[PDB]
Amino acid sequence: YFKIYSKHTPINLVRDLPQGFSALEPLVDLPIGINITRFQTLL
Amino acid sequence: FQPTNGVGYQPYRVVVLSFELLHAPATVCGPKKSTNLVKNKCVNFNFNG
Amino acid sequence: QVQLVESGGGLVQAGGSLRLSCAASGFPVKNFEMEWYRKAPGKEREWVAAIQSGGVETYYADSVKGRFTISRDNAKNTVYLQMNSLKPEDTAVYYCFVYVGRSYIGQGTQVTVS
């Protein structure tokens, strides 16, 4: 099963990721049966 | 395929609902009939899972 | 093993009659269904007449109802076709068909109506 969690974090900090607390809520779930070894993001 | 053909000669329309066994999501299933809910009683139940 | 051969053809005029035959071997006619097909020159192959395996029901194409008659013989293993009131549109090479394992098509006999 492949699953994706997400959160939005509406505060502003252009230096780095902040030190606050935010728990991520799931979005979807999908059975694939795939031995994933690597990935690549795209623009 | 003429209309004067017999029932073994006139065709039988075929669809195939094959079920194979692979590591794939079960996407299409049949309907699940659900009864009405009762409250405030000691009752067995069958929820969504 | 299974072989079909066609005989009984000839040259006829408008209004004549003929009786084709399809000798059969390797299968019984009571356990299989047969069809008759024809091939006009320049036209596609079309179904003419058929007998079911029980022999009760016989069927004919839409252009040849009321004029053709198909018959079978159990002992001689020969499939016949009696054709009457002939039009010049019926100029064709006639083939008998059966599905015994694979399809077997005979060599055909030229029948001209003119």
Curated annotation (Swiss-Prot), chain A:
Annotated glycosylation sites: N35
Role description: Attaches the virion to the cell membrane by interacting with host receptor, initiating the infection. The major receptor is host ACE2. When S2/S2' has been cleaved, binding to the receptor triggers direct fusion at the cell membrane. When S2/S2' has not been cleaved, binding to the receptor results in internalization of the virus by endocytosis using host TFRC and GRM2 and leading to fusion of the virion membrane with the host endosomal membrane. Alternatively, may use NRP1/NRP2 and integrin as entry receptors.
Subunit field text: Binds to host ACE2. RBD also interacts with the N-linked glycan on 'Asn-90' of ACE2. Cleavage of S generates a polybasic C-terminal sequence on S1 that binds to host Neuropilin-1 (NRP1) and Neuropilin-2 (NRP2) receptors. Interacts with host integrin alpha-5/beta-1 (ITGA5:ITGB1) and with ACE2 in complex with integrin alpha-5/beta-1 (ITGA5:ITGB1). May interact via cytoplasmic c-terminus with M protein. May interact (via N-terminus) with host bilirubin and biliverdin, thereby preventing antibody binding to the SARS-CoV-2 spike NTD via an allosteric mechanism.
Protein name in the entry: Spike protein S1
Gene name in the database record: S
Entire protein: shown range: 200 to 242 of 1273
